[PDB]
């Protein structure tokens, strides 16, 4: 409507919306090291 005060517009073809585009890569991780991710290797040496 701000541009419509300056120049004329016809009837639009279709309404155009704004949406969000983002890919979803995701991924996997084995638990043999990620299961002990709170347990840092300094604490591994402390427990050893």
């Amino acid at each position: 409507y701000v541009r419509e005060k300056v120049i004329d517009f016809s009837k639009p073809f279709m309404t155009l919306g704004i949406s969000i585009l983002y890919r979803k890569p995701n991924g996997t991780n084995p638990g043999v090291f990620s299961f002990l991710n709170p347990l840092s290797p300094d604490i591994w040496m402390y427990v050893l």
């Binding site: 991710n37 347990l39 840092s40 402390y46």
Partner: peptide, 28 residues
Amino acid sequence: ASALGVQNIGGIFIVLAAGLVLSVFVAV
């Protein structure tokens, strides 16, 4: 953030070492 030790866990190993030394000192 993630998890660590040191700040409050880092002094419990002093209690562990002192308890081991005191238990050896009783066991003599």
